[PDB]
Design an enzyme around this catalytic site. Structure first.
Site, mmCIF file in Angstrom:
data_model
loop_
_atom_site.group_PDB
_atom_site.id
_atom_site.type_symbol
_atom_site.label_atom_id
_atom_site.label_comp_id
_atom_site.label_asym_id
_atom_site.label_seq_id
_atom_site.Cartn_x
_atom_site.Cartn_y
_atom_site.Cartn_z
ATOM 1 N N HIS A 41 0.818 -1.221 0.000
ATOM 2 C CA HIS A 41 0.000 0.000 0.000
ATOM 3 C C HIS A 41 0.868 1.296 0.000
ATOM 4 O O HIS A 41 0.310 2.389 -0.104
ATOM 5 C CB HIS A 41 -1.090 0.004 1.083
ATOM 6 C CG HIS A 41 -0.584 0.238 2.469
ATOM 7 N ND1 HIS A 41 -0.430 -0.799 3.349
ATOM 8 C CD2 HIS A 41 -0.271 1.395 3.091
ATOM 9 C CE1 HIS A 41 0.006 -0.254 4.468
ATOM 10 N NE2 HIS A 41 0.114 1.067 4.356
ATOM 11 N N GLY A 143 2.288 6.002 9.527
ATOM 12 C CA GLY A 143 3.725 6.019 9.265
ATOM 13 C C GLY A 143 4.458 4.802 9.813
ATOM 14 O O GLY A 143 5.596 4.541 9.408
ATOM 15 N N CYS A 145 3.641 1.660 9.282
ATOM 16 C CA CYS A 145 3.541 0.517 8.382
ATOM 17 C C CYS A 145 4.889 0.113 7.857
ATOM 18 O O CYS A 145 5.755 0.954 7.684
ATOM 19 C CB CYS A 145 2.541 0.786 7.267
ATOM 20 S SG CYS A 145 0.884 1.159 7.875
HETATM 21 C C1 LIG Z 1 -3.336 5.035 10.726
HETATM 22 C C2 LIG Z 1 -2.660 3.755 11.143
HETATM 23 C C3 LIG Z 1 -2.394 3.499 12.485
HETATM 24 C C4 LIG Z 1 -1.779 2.316 12.845
HETATM 25 N N1 LIG Z 1 -1.406 1.378 11.969
HETATM 26 C C5 LIG Z 1 -1.653 1.611 10.675
HETATM 27 C C6 LIG Z 1 -2.280 2.767 10.208
HETATM 28 N N2 LIG Z 1 -2.604 2.928 8.839
HETATM 29 C C7 LIG Z 1 -3.769 2.527 8.287
HETATM 30 O O1 LIG Z 1 -4.663 1.990 8.932
HETATM 31 C C8 LIG Z 1 -3.855 2.683 6.768
HETATM 32 C C9 LIG Z 1 -4.541 1.460 6.176
HETATM 33 C C10 LIG Z 1 -5.908 1.246 6.320
HETATM 34 C C11 LIG Z 1 -6.505 0.103 5.808
HETATM 35 C C12 LIG Z 1 -5.743 -0.842 5.142
HETATM 36 C C13 LIG Z 1 -4.387 -0.624 5.009
HETATM 37 CL CL1 LIG Z 1 -3.417 -1.790 4.164
HETATM 38 C C14 LIG Z 1 -3.779 0.507 5.513
HETATM 39 C C15 LIG Z 1 -4.459 4.050 6.297
HETATM 40 C C16 LIG Z 1 -5.972 4.094 6.405
HETATM 41 C C17 LIG Z 1 -3.842 5.243 7.018
#
Ligand SMILES: Cc1ccncc1NC(=O)[C@@H](c1cccc(Cl)c1)C(C)C
Ligand SMILES: Cc1ccncc1NC(=O)[C@@H](c1cccc(Cl)c1)C(C)C
EC number: 3.4.19.12
Lengths: 304, 304
Positions: A41, A143, A145
């Protein structure tokens, strides 16, 4: 003396963290040999995440669109490919800090350390468990990820998790290093609900053994039980069913303490039925399930 | 999303760990520049520990009696001196992995990460707090002496603790890197009892702010209180008295959440008087006091 939620030393993994930028998105990458692993992503914009077609989005990306930076130096990207939900960016330089490593897909109930990173830089380390519903209860912000989960045996780092997302309930989902999600999660910004977060019974028993070893013995009772009787109680309290395999794995702790596994199961049964009554076990007022039988042995013996 | 007991990444400290042997005793040393720091009780036998005269025991030791090994290579010891309860072994080689560092003496209530080591090798990392009674609740076995406590800001490691001993109650005592014990402890195998382990009130409030930030808000009530009224309750529950300095330090968390510090104090007051009622806050069934206001900000903002 003492028992702590202990993470593996993170140094070997810190030397692998890099920053990956594609267009406007920046996340973390894991640089092992001449390959950088990162969530696919990274190629998405915020709008793309609603319903991404990764194969189609990847067509518009060339090697030069993936900016890989280790510390303050740029790595040259000479190849790129998608494997399930991860991108593998072939760079022209092997990471000189690559430790001995393996890629493992863990089973639920197993624990691991997470090196949380932002912009390729480490922020902290903590211990996690793969929940029975295939989520992890981590601490991750936007950030983070590409941050990874791992175990270490002697000098070999077994990477088991790469962080991809947070579910609307504040829990986390991710993949193994082959890009396959744990559980049924998809890398899409769509409402995905987690199933029942059941308690890891074998881990709770392991932690009760750790408690006895360290002096907290008030919960030891005069009772015993059977696997079938214990499991009737476990089902009621949303605990994972205990098997003879779990009993076998508790063998060394049972042998060290002299407390039969089924006797410890009867103590756990009374703890579930009566509660703690305002008391604590290893500084906790609840039954801790994120220490495996192997973690207890390692911590209680001093494995380096 | 999520809140974990997070340790600093340990890599910079792993590159400093060495093994020190003197006679039959082996413990850990911290190698910074051309100096190796270790507990002075490395010169003692088990019999010596009952009533050691360190100045007298050190007379029988020469540079060649201190065996310093970094990984599998031996360091040449060209000088040795005793500073309070630590030995400083001057070696002929500066540690090439020496990070930017400082030696700090922390105040009780402050937190730090511990890299537990055995035979100069790291076993794990966890987060600790210097208790108000100057003990730490760690996880240490025989051979872990010389393991260090530290904080990291950007690229600078502030070393604050070196492990020396376990009290008969399973808690731990040690020194700063100048060899001065925290609290009234002496490096002697004599019964030394710890004082009251009071709760770090400002840390509990910081953790309640972290909980609100992450969605656990059930404990927020319609009440407020004063510093004097809150402290009457704190005294009753063996909590540290809260000062205007603690209120000032909670300012940024108060500003972010919009919950006045004294309102959060009233929530904490009701939590002390009524208990949790079988509920949890950030996965805990008790009030967590080993996160400082700075730790909460760092974790909740993603400081690397
Ligand atoms: C904001 C956060 C906080 C903690 N860990 C990860 C994120 N990141 C997302 O949850 C992202 C996301 C959402 C849905 C699927 C995927 Cl692959 C990635 C994006 C919505 C910011
Ligand atoms: C066994 C252990 C476990 C955890 N941490 C440290 C130790 N080590 C000691 O407590 C040692 C000790 C006792 C009294 C004073 C001093 Cl300076 C050192 C020794 C009695 C073995």
């Amino acid at each position: 003396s003492g028992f702590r939620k202990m993470a593996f030393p993170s140094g070997k993994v810190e030397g692998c963290m890099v920053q990956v930028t594609c267009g406007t998105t920046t996340l973390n990458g894991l640089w092992l040999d001449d390959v950088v692993y990162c969530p696919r992503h990274v190629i998405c914009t915020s709008e793309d995440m609603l319903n991404p077609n990764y194969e189609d989005l990847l067509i518009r990306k060339s090697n030069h669109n993936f900016l890989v930076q280790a510390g303050n130096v740029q790595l040259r990207v000479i190849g790129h490919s998608m494997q399930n939900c991860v991108l593998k960016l072939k760079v022209d330089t092997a990471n000189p800090k690559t430790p001995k490593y393996k890629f493992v897909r863990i089973q639920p109930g197993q624990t691991f350390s997470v090196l949380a990173c932002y912009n390729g830089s480490p922020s902290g380390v903590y211990q996690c468990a793969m929940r029975p519903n295939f989520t992890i209860k981590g601490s991750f912000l936007n950030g983070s990820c590409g941050s990874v989960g791992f175990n270490i045996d002697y000098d070999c780092v077994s990477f088991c998790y790469m962080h991809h997302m947070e579910l609307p309930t504040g829990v986390h989902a991710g993949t193994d290093l082959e890009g396959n999600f744990y559980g049924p999660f998809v890398d899409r910004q769509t409402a995905q609900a987690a199933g029942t977060d059941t308690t890891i019974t074998v881990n709770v028993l392991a932690w009760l053994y750790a408690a006895v070893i360290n002096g907290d013995r008030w919960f030891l009772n005069r009772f015993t039980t059977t696997l079938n009787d214990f499991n009737l109680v476990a089902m009621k309290y949303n605990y994972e069913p205990l098997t003879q395999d779990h009993v076998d794995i508790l063998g060394p702790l049972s042998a060290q303490t002299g407390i039969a596994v089924l006797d410890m199961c009867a103590s756990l049964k009374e703890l579930l039925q009566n509660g703690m009554n305002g008391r604590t076990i290893l500084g906790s007022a609840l039954l801790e399930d994120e220490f495996t039988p192997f973690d207890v042995v390692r911590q209680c013996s001093g494995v380096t």
